[PDB]
């Protein structure tokens, strides 16, 4: 059996983001991700093959999934972002 219920088990509080700008500060990131509520913790790529992408951690799974949808196709600095879950 495979039914359809909201708040799916395939999602976690850890959200992967792609197409992030190469030049950004914590100042901007806390203003962007904090727009939806409190943020648990953030890390950013520091190697040549990680820079440009990052994973964010929300305090809840509810608020995470709420913003996950509303942040899909969001355009900033004339570029669109991409959201994915932690597998």
């Amino acid at each position: 059996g495979r039914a359809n219920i909201r708040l799916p088990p395939e999602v976690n509080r850890i959200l992967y983001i792609r197409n992030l700008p190469y030049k950004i500060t914590a100042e901007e990131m806390y203003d962007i991700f904090g727009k939806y509520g409190p943020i648990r913790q953030i890390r950013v790529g520091n190697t040549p093959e990680t820079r440009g992408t990052a994973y964010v951690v929300y305090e809840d799974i509810f608020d995470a999934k709420n913003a996950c949808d509303h942040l899909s196709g969001f355009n900033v600095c004339n570029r669109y972002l991409v959201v994915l879950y932690y597998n």
Partner: protein, 47 residues
């Protein structure tokens, strides 16, 4: 004179233990390699 000698053995896996629950520290173990932490800027005072 006697060529006194010895032998060597091995050991199996370690005994049971009780790993911590899904605490904050597991987030470090779950994050990919090459990702530095992003703490907030010093003196940040939002509204």
């Amino acid at each position: 004179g006697t060529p006194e000698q010895l032998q060597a053995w091995r050991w199996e896996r370690e005994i049971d233990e009780r790993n911590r629950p899904l605490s904050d520290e597991e987030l470090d173990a779950m994050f990919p390699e090459g990702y530095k932490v992003l703490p907030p800027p010093a003196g940040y005072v939002p509204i």
